[PDB]
Structure 1
Amino acid sequence: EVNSFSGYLKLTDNVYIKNADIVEEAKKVKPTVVVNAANVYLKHGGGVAGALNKATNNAMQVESDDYIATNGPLKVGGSCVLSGHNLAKHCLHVVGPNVNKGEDIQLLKSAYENFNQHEVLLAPLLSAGIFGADPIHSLRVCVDTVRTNVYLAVFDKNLYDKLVSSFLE
């Protein structure tokens, strides 16, 4: 079964959301594309990126180091397409702004625009958690920007409930 997403709540015609761990979603669904919440040097040291890398038994990190050696770092708001390993056909590494480190929140629109190069994606909420963006603002930018089919996995029931209530107001 291809892109077998289950238990999502449809918010708009192309944005769906679930209270779920993106790693467990990728193992079950084996989507065509999983989005990583990357940094510009593709160092997957913790958070979502560390969890996805650990689920590949460090194969994602070795591949990422080799991409950085040949191409240099990404820009904030940018992305690159690498292997999905055992989690997906492809991993789209997207760098949202880290507001806690002084990066511009306006780059969150550029970060979501990368999603439009892929017909179907499993993704986390960009710049949320320790990147410091307001997660309700990140959802609003996702809904206004992404035009392809995106399945958002948010691994926190408290935040999930706040995002759905914020959308349905």
Structure 2
Amino acid sequence: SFSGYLKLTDNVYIKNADIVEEAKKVKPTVVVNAANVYLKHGGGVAGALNKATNNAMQVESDDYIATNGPLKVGGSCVLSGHNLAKHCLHVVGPNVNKGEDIQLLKSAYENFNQHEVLLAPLLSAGIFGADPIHSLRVCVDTVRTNVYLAVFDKNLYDKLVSSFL
């Protein structure tokens, strides 16, 4: 199971790790993807998770979008976890670089409450443009289920832990 995590709260854990490497090691029930409404896994966590599945996640996502249309910002969908997890919960946090409403970050994290345990990135952080310190704050104030956060960037991991209230 999950190892080397620092406990932030009763249910939120954090580790400086590559989420793809964590997923291959643990093979959790749910790995969260930092998705966009079109499930186009181009960069950041999405591009990295997709590449680890040999593009199977993108082929599956294209079929999902053809059948159901795009997701909403703040929404999610459960698809296969392929070689990384039992399932992948594709969650759409607001992308500030696309002018999306940062207020939707709480709705995005609420999707985690439908799963007892998850391996996840900080939503809307990285290329999504939001402040990761604010994303961690929304995470601990919204998620009630067991969330194991993987933070790729070492300097950011240290800043998140050191500034955690």
CA distance in 1, matches of 2:12, 2:35: 21
Measured on the aligned residues, the alpha-carbon RMSD in Å equals 0.6
Q: Secondary structure of the residue that 1:150 maps to in structure 2? A: strand
Return structure 1 stretches of 4+ with deviation > 2 angstroms: none
Count of residues paired in the alignment: 165
Cα deviation for residue 47 of structure 1 reads: 1.2
User: 1:25-70 deviations in whole A, cap 9, x for unaligned?
Assistant: 0000000000000000000011110100010001000000000000
Displacement of 1:85: 0.4
SS at match of 1:106: helix
Report the 3-state secondary structure (helix = DSSP H, G, I; strand = E; otherwise coil) of the residue aligned with 1:39: coil
> Counterparts of 2:45 and 2:8 in 1: how far apart (Å)?
23
Distance between the aligned counterparts of 1:106 and 1:26, measured in 2?
A: 29
SS in structure 1 at match of 2:15: strand
Q: Deviations over 1:52-94 (max 9, x none)?
A: 0010001000000000000000000000000000100000000
Residue segments in structure 1 that go unaligned for 5+ positions in a row: none
- Any gaps of 5 or more consecutive residues in structure 2? none
Which residue of the other structure, out of 21, 26, 29, is the alignment partner of 1:24?
A: 21
Partner of 1:143: 140
Question: 1:50, 1:134 → 2: CA distance?
Answer: 21
**Whole-angstrom CA distance in 1 between matches of 2:70 and 2:111:** 16
> 2:4 maps to what in 1?
7
From 132, 147, 160, give the equivalent of 1:163: 160
SS in 2 for 1:121: strand
Deviation digits for residues 116-150 of structure 1, max 9, x if unmatched?
00000000010011111111000000000000000
SS in 2 for 1:93: strand
3-state SS of paired residue (1:44):
coil
The alignment partner of 2:13 has SS state of strand
Structure 1 length-normalised TM? 0.97
Supply the distance in 2 between the matched residues of 1:166 and 1:157 (Cα, whole angstroms). Answer: 14
CA distance in 1, matches of 2:112, 2:32: 8
Q: Distance in 2 between matches of 1:158 and 1:21?
A: 14
Alpha-carbon distance between aligned partners in 1 of 2:52 and 2:99, rounded to the nearest angstrom: 30
1:166 Cα deviation after fit: 1.0
